[PDB]
């Protein structure tokens, strides 16, 4: 256990193992990767983002978050694989090299660390944050119903004990506010991808309203192209479309907020599978899932650099 070359990418890891992995990666590739702390979780754990960059200052950027819902383990595992992949392909793959030569990538592998630690020690299916709610015996907020986009509208719950509880007010969760503040302060994000599981869907805005986004034709074509690239490897079938027309109303979601902040290429991926194993996806599917998802993500990044 001395390098990222001996790390086991084909198994699920604990929070500490993932945080340790980030430090190893930074130690091995200091000229390409840096670890930023953008805030703390409710319970006090650091919230880290890896910044991949070849230079410049405030270059156009791509945001990718994983694990905002703690039980979706395939997402944190895919994030760890992505981090290593970026360091292997820069300078080797012509397309990825061109992207990193012009844009920075910010990767948040464990967006909800308190919930992630809770899924390892007490409840494997925990989805929410672990914030304490006064007046309630229930804990946590659905961090993907806490954003300032149609906040509080249908598609979320005002019940603290609900799995889709939206919280007292928009950005009440420090895990969410941390990203909001970082993205707004940076001000030059061009793409915002939030990774979840499961269902095998690639979605664009909106989830809170049936109104079509002005960029619907373009984003729809980008999603169609990304799903085709993804499918080419193992034949995995994904559907794509707007959130509301594909999986129904959902309010306070992250990509609806990012699109409304002017970040055009805002998409959410729902990875494998479609329900056979669900959240308990076998570890043997980690690498194949990461590899095919990479093709879809790269396709989207290629479209942003050229746009
Ligand atoms: Zn999710």
From Swiss-Prot:
Principal cellular location given in the protein's record: secreted
Record keywords: Carboxypeptidase, Disulfide bond, Hydrolase, Metal-binding, Metalloprotease, Protease, Secreted, Signal, Zinc, Zymogen
One GO CC annotation: extracellular space
Keyword Iron: no
Catalytic activity of the protein: Release of a C-terminal amino acid, but little or no action with -Asp, -Glu, -Arg, -Lys or -Pro; leukotriene C4 + H2O = leukotriene F4 + glycine
Residue positions binding substrate: 69-72, 127, 144-145, 197-198, 248
Subcellular location, record wording: Secreted
Top EC class of this enzyme: hydrolase
GO BP: any one term: leukotriene metabolic process
Record comment: activity regulation: Inhibited by interaction with the S.magnifica carboxypeptidase inhibitor SmCI.
Cofactor: Zn(2+)
Binding positions (Zn(2+)): 69, 72, 196
Highest taxon in the source lineage: Eukaryota
Subunit note: Monomer. May form a complex with proelastase 2.
Function according to Swiss-Prot or TrEMBL: Carboxypeptidase that catalyzes the release of a C-terminal amino acid, but has little or no action with -Asp, -Glu, -Arg, -Lys or -Pro. Catalyzes the conversion of leukotriene C4 to leukotriene F4 via the hydrolysis of an amide bond.
Name of the protein described by the UniProt record: Carboxypeptidase A1
Source organism phylogeny: Eukaryota, Metazoa, Chordata, Craniata, Vertebrata
Entire-sequence positions represented here: 111 to 417 of 419
